[PDB]
Write an enzyme that holds these catalytic residues in place. Structure first.
Site, PDB file in Angstrom:
ATOM      1  N   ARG A 117     -16.035  49.195 -11.642  1.00  0.00           N
ATOM      2  CA  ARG A 117     -16.425  48.413 -10.413  1.00  0.00           C
ATOM      3  C   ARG A 117     -15.258  48.283  -9.398  1.00  0.00           C
ATOM      4  O   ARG A 117     -15.483  48.079  -8.221  1.00  0.00           O
ATOM      5  CB  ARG A 117     -17.014  47.016 -10.766  1.00  0.00           C
ATOM      6  CG  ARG A 117     -15.992  46.034 -11.359  1.00  0.00           C
ATOM      7  CD  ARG A 117     -16.574  44.690 -11.896  1.00  0.00           C
ATOM      8  NE  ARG A 117     -16.244  44.543 -13.326  1.00  0.00           N
ATOM      9  CZ  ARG A 117     -15.182  43.914 -13.805  1.00  0.00           C
ATOM     10  NH1 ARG A 117     -14.310  43.324 -12.978  1.00  0.00           N
ATOM     11  NH2 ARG A 117     -14.995  43.891 -15.117  1.00  0.00           N
ATOM     12  N   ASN A 118     -14.027  48.432  -9.872  1.00  0.00           N
ATOM     13  CA  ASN A 118     -12.811  48.299  -9.076  1.00  0.00           C
ATOM     14  C   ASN A 118     -12.183  49.634  -8.672  1.00  0.00           C
ATOM     15  O   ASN A 118     -11.030  49.685  -8.204  1.00  0.00           O
ATOM     16  CB  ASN A 118     -11.790  47.454  -9.848  1.00  0.00           C
ATOM     17  CG  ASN A 118     -12.223  45.997  -9.968  1.00  0.00           C
ATOM     18  OD1 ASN A 118     -12.857  45.454  -9.069  1.00  0.00           O
ATOM     19  ND2 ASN A 118     -11.896  45.373 -11.077  1.00  0.00           N
TER      20      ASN A 118
ATOM     21  N   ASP B 206      -7.495  43.743 -14.485  1.00  0.00           N
ATOM     22  CA  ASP B 206      -8.972  43.846 -14.291  1.00  0.00           C
ATOM     23  C   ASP B 206      -9.455  45.295 -14.061  1.00  0.00           C
ATOM     24  O   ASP B 206     -10.192  45.573 -13.126  1.00  0.00           O
ATOM     25  CB  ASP B 206      -9.429  42.889 -13.147  1.00  0.00           C
ATOM     26  CG  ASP B 206     -10.945  42.697 -13.069  1.00  0.00           C
ATOM     27  OD1 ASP B 206     -11.722  42.982 -14.032  1.00  0.00           O
ATOM     28  OD2 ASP B 206     -11.378  42.272 -11.989  1.00  0.00           O
TER      29      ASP B 206
ATOM     30  N   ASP C  33      -9.113  48.131  -6.105  1.00  0.00           N
ATOM     31  CA  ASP C  33      -8.974  46.690  -6.091  1.00  0.00           C
ATOM     32  C   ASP C  33      -8.014  46.255  -7.145  1.00  0.00           C
ATOM     33  O   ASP C  33      -7.940  46.893  -8.215  1.00  0.00           O
ATOM     34  CB  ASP C  33     -10.314  46.049  -6.402  1.00  0.00           C
ATOM     35  CG  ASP C  33     -10.443  44.647  -5.821  1.00  0.00           C
ATOM     36  OD1 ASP C  33     -10.534  44.508  -4.571  1.00  0.00           O
ATOM     37  OD2 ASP C  33     -10.457  43.684  -6.617  1.00  0.00           O
TER      38      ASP C  33
HETATM   39  C1  LIG Z   1     -10.304  48.306  -0.716  1.00  0.00           C
HETATM   40  C2  LIG Z   1     -11.563  48.569   0.063  1.00  0.00           C
HETATM   41  C3  LIG Z   1     -11.578  47.716   1.312  1.00  0.00           C
HETATM   42  O1  LIG Z   1     -11.504  49.931   0.480  1.00  0.00           O
HETATM   43  C4  LIG Z   1     -12.685  50.548   0.583  1.00  0.00           C
HETATM   44  C5  LIG Z   1     -14.004  50.285   0.290  1.00  0.00           C
HETATM   45  C6  LIG Z   1     -14.728  51.447   0.699  1.00  0.00           C
HETATM   46  N1  LIG Z   1     -16.090  51.657   0.625  1.00  0.00           N
HETATM   47  C7  LIG Z   1     -17.045  50.836   0.010  1.00  0.00           C
HETATM   48  N2  LIG Z   1     -16.718  49.659  -0.543  1.00  0.00           N
HETATM   49  C8  LIG Z   1     -17.710  48.981  -1.137  1.00  0.00           C
HETATM   50  N3  LIG Z   1     -17.460  47.742  -1.753  1.00  0.00           N
HETATM   51  C9  LIG Z   1     -16.117  47.209  -1.631  1.00  0.00           C
HETATM   52  C10 LIG Z   1     -16.248  45.707  -1.814  1.00  0.00           C
HETATM   53  C11 LIG Z   1     -15.266  47.672  -2.746  1.00  0.00           C
HETATM   54  C12 LIG Z   1     -13.924  47.684  -2.511  1.00  0.00           C
HETATM   55  C13 LIG Z   1     -13.075  48.108  -3.503  1.00  0.00           C
HETATM   56  C14 LIG Z   1     -13.601  48.499  -4.701  1.00  0.00           C
HETATM   57  F1  LIG Z   1     -12.733  48.896  -5.657  1.00  0.00           F
HETATM   58  C15 LIG Z   1     -14.968  48.457  -4.873  1.00  0.00           C
HETATM   59  N4  LIG Z   1     -15.813  48.051  -3.906  1.00  0.00           N
HETATM   60  N5  LIG Z   1     -18.992  49.368  -1.214  1.00  0.00           N
HETATM   61  C16 LIG Z   1     -19.299  50.521  -0.644  1.00  0.00           C
HETATM   62  C17 LIG Z   1     -18.351  51.286  -0.030  1.00  0.00           C
HETATM   63 CL1  LIG Z   1     -18.861  52.774   0.656  1.00  0.00          CL
HETATM   64  N6  LIG Z   1     -13.883  52.356   1.204  1.00  0.00           N
HETATM   65  N7  LIG Z   1     -12.680  51.789   1.115  1.00  0.00           N
END
Ligand SMILES: CC(C)Oc1cc(Nc2nc(N[C@@H](C)c3ccc(F)cn3)ncc2Cl)[nH]n1
Ligand SMILES: CC(C)Oc1cc(Nc2nc(N[C@@H](C)c3ccc(F)cn3)ncc2Cl)[nH]n1
Ligand SMILES: CC(C)Oc1cc(Nc2nc(N[C@@H](C)c3ccc(F)cn3)ncc2Cl)[nH]n1
Ligand SMILES: CC(C)Oc1cc(Nc2nc(N[C@@H](C)c3ccc(F)cn3)ncc2Cl)[nH]n1
Ligand SMILES: CC(C)Oc1cc(Nc2nc(N[C@@H](C)c3ccc(F)cn3)ncc2Cl)[nH]n1
Ligand SMILES: CC(C)Oc1cc(Nc2nc(N[C@@H](C)c3ccc(F)cn3)ncc2Cl)[nH]n1
Ligand SMILES: CC(C)Oc1cc(Nc2nc(N[C@@H](C)c3ccc(F)cn3)ncc2Cl)[nH]n1
Ligand SMILES: [Zn+2]
Ligand SMILES: [Zn+2]
Ligand SMILES: [Zn+2]
Ligand SMILES: [Zn+2]
Ligand SMILES: [Zn+2]
Ligand SMILES: [Zn+2]
Ligand SMILES: [Zn+2]
Ligand SMILES: [Zn+2]
Ligand SMILES: [Zn+2]
Ligand SMILES: [Zn+2]
Ligand SMILES: [Zn+2]
Ligand SMILES: [Zn+2]
Ligand SMILES: [Zn+2]
Ligand SMILES: [Zn+2]
Lengths: 260, 261, 258, 261, 261, 258, 260
Positions: C140-141, C136, C154
């Site tokens: 977006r990931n 994937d 992700d």
């Molecule tokens: C793996 C994740 C927990 O690590 C992260 C996420 C962030 N900061 C932000 N994350 C998000 N959305 C999350 C759902 C996300 C996680 C992974 C990914 F590839 C995309 N989006 N939105 C805003 C922020 Cl600032 N830091 N570390």
């Protein structure tokens, strides 16, 4: 230990502070917690396994929350009876009993004091909304008052606080951030009426009628129109038209610095 | 550990202090419990090895560890893995208040300033309890202990009805509250001033129950000033709401203890 | 402890960063984690047992995967609710939102765009060298941190999928290059959805009948040659991720500028 | 711990070294395993999460921890609480002996003194095994590893029959002994000197089995002196009791390694 | 089966006869229960599905199957495998005695020979119980039933204290015996002759308890001859040993039923 | 056997009659059930344990409920998959579809319409006499068999709900009359949805602010007086179902004809 | 017994009839079943608990099915090994092996015979569709042939019969009634080609290409255009345009009475 554990043997009980549905809250002396100090000890009566779960779960959430206007959580002891949860001691008790005993029924809290109380509750609620956490029971009975008029959200938890609920929560059981603002508006109203029950004349069914009919609580006498504007912004019919708790907090914060 | 555990290897039994329904109480030495090595303690050793009993004992320990007051017997710890089940408390050398009263009476006996200090001390313990919304249900001198310096503390929490010490509402309507405990304290005041006489001693259980149920009060003791007997009387109102507060009862007794009639 | 444990009590939630299907991600302060600091906390909604063991296993893998361009895994707590996984905080959020923001709707220059691409490819070389198939890979990931640091964040997204994965359900490191090709396109179109004009169905027909995505306006031909190299119909004829990354890294340092 | 446990948090995977039936082998860094911080290791990561498989893996670890020899691959530890199951070993950078032989042959290749050192080294490993009365059952160059300095060690213990490397008694009468292992070592010598050619490559499994069963020996390799081919021949006697001792086989090879023809 | 089981498929519910704390009572048809096909029955359907409740229900059934008397409600069977739990009894069409009395009083009412037959019938049921040394603990007209032909039977066994019907020994000293049941029967006689009036209706529970505890007897009903009120009075002696035997009480009532004053 | 068991082997499925949330209903032939015949077989999709015990209990109730106007329950099999409940076959399907079919979109006459209504009310008297609250009484939950036999076939449908059940969540036999009133309206409008013009939300506001449904074109005033009697705001002021049924039965035999 | 149970002791095995993935099918003599007779006995090899479940479940469904053109199910024995399922004996085996041995590679089945075979399979499929049951693997290998050319559906059960699947089943894994008609069309094609593998020249991946590309199988030589019209009606791109199996059965039934 993952959640903080407080040893029973470090807690000496002093006297009862109050009663909840869950059981009792005592004043205690807690030895070896921060480098003796007074603490409030919530002690569960139920003792079952369903309730012991919910208690652990609450402790699990609360160890991660931390805000100037949320009551400080210190730890838990779930092995043994009663189940104990320890918090910071707020010596003036719940905000509703405080308003009622510091109003017309030093003299009553002045406008500026009322705006400080409102602003502190709102601040707590910006933290919750920003966390995407829905309280569902915001009311003055669920807030605490400390020395020097420090006020914090004190409690987070079929019985329904119907007078604080918007139509869409009464009808469809939809609890959101925007229903929490509604409840905040009614909190403002409780503050400016010195702790009055919203729709006090009316019965529960009559209260539902008024809420569902679109009838707004009256402007309290101690309440300037700019504050009543804030109430009304919390009380919009459609949830998406309702003001953000962030806007609401800013407006009250501004009002409390330079009062009209 | 959450509750203080006392290792069996740290206890040496000296001799039996007394018996209860639960089992036995011994005088023991205890090695390294508080910051000198050896110290004398009382050891409650449980008869029944039942799992239900073992639970209750565990439950009792995790209440008493949180209690602490100058006029409640000091709880040191427990051991529930082994037989017999052990609970350790501070040693009160003069034993239970009832047998003490009977021993230091006309059958030199105890003065007025002394008997008052005894009653003041029990009341102090009971203020602590009422302030916690804890209902004792079996306050009596047999359940208090006396230590060196005429120090007196609540020693037992009951754990079959003590009908003579009970008010009408507890007998008839079965209601136990903080005000049924002030009643019993009134009957405790009467015990103290009669030097440990059983309340309604000539009467049997069948008729004591009738006596209290119809509103017949206890007679004033010889050694008892009438200001004191007033305190007893304030505790004995028919209606619970009318009865004195243990805080007030204690304030009066602490007053009379300084200026004895 | 075998997997690193994050004590619930060392966490203080600040606010929600975003939502997933899994639940929620929070910005938190973390107490004594490395010799106070900000972290991303993944809090799982599910709470079940299928999902609770799945979360443990995910943590057991992630613990051993470290790379400058894979988001850093700090630890876990499955002892309690909700289940917590703690990662480094990437302050600029997902790379798609970032591309849309910093695009013509001040725009990033060729060299920045190529740095973004190079970083995603570096993460993909690590994975392919481990023989790990992502399945994937899309902007977006990926996550963006301070200084334009970009990492994979992700682990059917049909628009990023090659014909063999649509038609025959074959997922390989060579289907991952294909997806990286599509990622390159997203980067150079400032986060546009591939085949945006068409719908979920007419797109799969376009992929299947050999149709390639248009060269983006911001895309030098030597970069389009990279994409086209990822987008060969025959899996074995597709450029290796290692060669793709080498090229993009070389071009990020020494660009064609137009 | 009884067997050394390696914490997952101390392993960082670099890239895959190869595949097996069990699962996968990765190159990894390992933090604080031996008294510097970081060091490169090989990590055998198990595919199946079966409880039966998890046991066998545990069983394998508690054998290998007791083994240790210059010519057996060094085992560092295990982790069986988690997925995938992990076993950690020393990194042998040149990989398996078969693919190495094929790589450093006519398809500069490996000299005689080199090919001899390779065979000497395998034999050393096999003396250790025979001295322990351990039967390998699957000795072949695919199951040996090569490290820096042309260091070679036994790398795998088998864990479907390798029929071509098997003597007649193991095929026919199903007997595996220390002397069926010297046979296989003979076939390993043949592998080394043919630079990794499969034994009886033109033949299929159905006919290889017939070939060995009737006493047809393998042809002498080009690069192979006849004194060396003698050693192979001593390993290939029809009767197990007649075959050479791996100790002797090794003594000869260690001899020829010093004075190469 | 040991206790008669009634198959759910043999019951068709008609309408609800009434409610209790346990759950609900329905009128039902029952197919092949006694040697014609269909017959009307009452079905006690249990609210709680608790395993503790399911046991008690089972326990109740295996008592009632052994009971049988003209003046105890006939028990037919049970089904405890399924929900709700079912107990089947004979249909008594006029319902409970209290509501019946209130219905056939001055608010034509019931004659003297009738009211006597009602009291005689309850007493008969109670002789059976006393002869078995069974203590009812909650005899009251609300717990009797009335069928066609003015047939009256004990309908419930109690299963929170009915303080007004209790004698002083049951309130004070908590003693329930066969003579506390004759007391209650006395209060039942008073119910019958007042056409279902609650005993001490003006009074509340707090003061009723005081009233009985001090020896204040119930007033003679208008419709009640003084020979009858004597029977009530014999039931109301302070001392249990003095009270009349239900056998005698019944003999008197059966006498007066033949020759009404 | 305590509840009647239908042996799987005595069933032969013919074809599907309809679908529910529960799963599917089939027309089947049933072998030796009463001294071959057609039955409706309810086959549950769920297969779980919450739902499997729920199905058993439903059968344990239904076994004791018999009435000329409640669909006949024949038996059950929970020993196997799918879970089976067998009922009598009502050949004309649900009463709403039947009303729409036999309406002006040859129509049923006043006396037939009143027979339909009378039959539904008869089922409702049985239930109210058992103190059973239905909660979802609507023509979609009734069945039509040969000869215009109509029975209750199934046990927030806001449009059929009274104000106290919308606002205060009170469900009583008097809220059931209210719903029966709405059922009367459906019958006399040939199966129209109550408050069809309005949407799921503006309808609840209409119910709440005391607004009554319009008298249908096919509805004599004496029938509308019945509806209006069911539609009193005060629950205790509402007509009893027993009196409603008496009236409708009397009017079905001796109608006003216009 | 709820599903019919056949006692092992009443089954005497005669010889093997064929092999499935599940195990073996034998010819048996079954004593005391209808008022000795020949039966086919499906015997499961796997013996596990997962498979023993699926076997019971299949028996549970099949006891309730009954149609002239579905193989007759007689009962089961799941207590013991092997797990046994007994059915009616169809002596000419599977329809694919039958077509292949009764075509050009009495002479070949005539047009009218081919239309009778097609009509019987279709009839079975109207029963299934009417039950809202999706077969998912309709193919001639899954049909049985009895004495006097009686043909019935013989089997009802990742491995995918990709040559018989429509695009939407290949791509989206959506199996419906309308994908079963598609498969029926390919069944028609198998019948008129005397049992040929659809897309036989091509590999599985090449077959997928053709199906996904919208390429139709060619009209067989033995196949009149009116039958090929029927095939094409089964082979519409959009599922909702595809003909009902009911229409398809009628058309073939009409064709079989008065053949063109
Ligand atoms: C793996 C994740 C927990 O690590 C992260 C996420 C962030 N900061 C932000 N994350 C998000 N959305 C999350 C759902 C996300 C996680 C992974 C990914 F590839 C995309 N989006 N939105 C805003 C922020 Cl600032 N830091 N570390
Ligand atoms: C969260 C609680 C345990 O923390 C507290 C409570 C106090 N002090 C007092 N609390 C109360 N009543 C309790 C039941 C209460 C708790 C929470 C709340 F929002 C309202 N009331 N009554 C008097 C006092 Cl002084 N300190 N810390
Ligand atoms: C709570 C007890 C174990 O602590 C004690 C007891 C003593 N000393 C004595 N106790 C007794 N009788 C025991 C049974 C007792 C316990 C409690 C109570 F209220 C009254 N009596 N007999 C003689 C002595 Cl010296 N010290 N600490
Ligand atoms: C026992 C193993 C895990 O220790 C190793 C392996 C390596 N290096 C390499 N191994 C392989 N293939 C593995 C599957 C292998 C293991 C044992 C064996 F005898 C032969 N092959 N491929 C390449 C390398 Cl570099 N170092 N330590
Ligand atoms: C033991 C019972 C189930 O047998 C009965 C009840 C009736 N008839 C009626 N019962 C009631 N109320 C029930 C609750 C009842 C049961 C026992 C009792 F002593 C008093 N009341 N209400 C009306 C009738 Cl008609 N027949 N058989
Ligand atoms: C209770 C059911 C199983 O009894 C039935 C159903 C029929 N006939 C038909 N049922 C349906 N739809 C089913 C879902 C249904 C059941 C109950 C209900 F109130 C409404 N609809 N559709 C057509 C027919 Cl012919 N007979 N017995
Ligand atoms: C459903 C089956 C057990 O019923 C049968 C099969 C036969 N006769 C034959 N079956 C077979 N092969 C079996 C595996 C078979 C079963 C079903 C199917 F659709 C196709 N093939 N081979 C030869 C015969 Cl004669 N009678 N009843
Ligand atoms: Zn603890
Ligand atoms: Zn959220
Ligand atoms: Zn111990
Ligand atoms: Zn309290
Ligand atoms: Zn943790
Ligand atoms: Zn690999
Ligand atoms: Zn480990
Ligand atoms: Zn040996
Ligand atoms: Zn039963
Ligand atoms: Zn007896
Ligand atoms: Zn069954
Ligand atoms: Zn009821
Ligand atoms: Zn069997
Ligand atoms: Zn369907």
């Amino acid at each position: 230990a993952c959640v903080h554990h407080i040893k029973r043997r470090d807690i000496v009980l002093k006297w009862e502070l109050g009663e909840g549905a869950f059981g009792k809250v005592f004043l205690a002396e807690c030895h070896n917690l921060l480098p003796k100090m007074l603490v409030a000890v919530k002690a569960l009566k139920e003792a079952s396994e369903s309730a012991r779960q919910d208690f652990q779960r609450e402790a699990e959430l609360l160890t991660m929350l931390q805000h100037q206007h949320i009551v400080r959580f210190f730890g838990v002891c779930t092995e043994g009876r009663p189940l104990l949860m320890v918090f910071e001691y707020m010596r003036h008790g719940d905000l509703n009993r405080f308003l009622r005993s510091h109003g017309p029924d030093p003299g009553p809290l002045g406008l500026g004091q009322l705006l400080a109380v409102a602003s502190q509750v709102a601040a707590g609620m910006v933290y919750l909304a920003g966390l995407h956490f829905v309280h569902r029971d915001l009311a003055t009975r669920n807030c605490l008052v400390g020395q020097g008029l420090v006020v914090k959200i004190g409690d987070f938890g079929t019985m329904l606080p119907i007078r604080w609920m918007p139509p869409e929560s009464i009808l469809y059981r939809k609890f959101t951030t925007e229903s929490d603002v509604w409840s905040f508006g009614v909190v403002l109203w409780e503050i400016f009426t010195y702790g009055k029950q919203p729709w006090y004349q009316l019965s529960n069914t009559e209260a539902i009628d008024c809420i569902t009919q679109g009838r707004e609580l009256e402007r309290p006498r101690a309440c300037p129109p700019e504050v009543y504007a804030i109430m009304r912004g919390c009380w919009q019919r459609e949830p998406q038209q309702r003001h953000s708790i962030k806007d609401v907090h800013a407006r009250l914060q501004a009002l409390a610095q330079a009062p009209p």
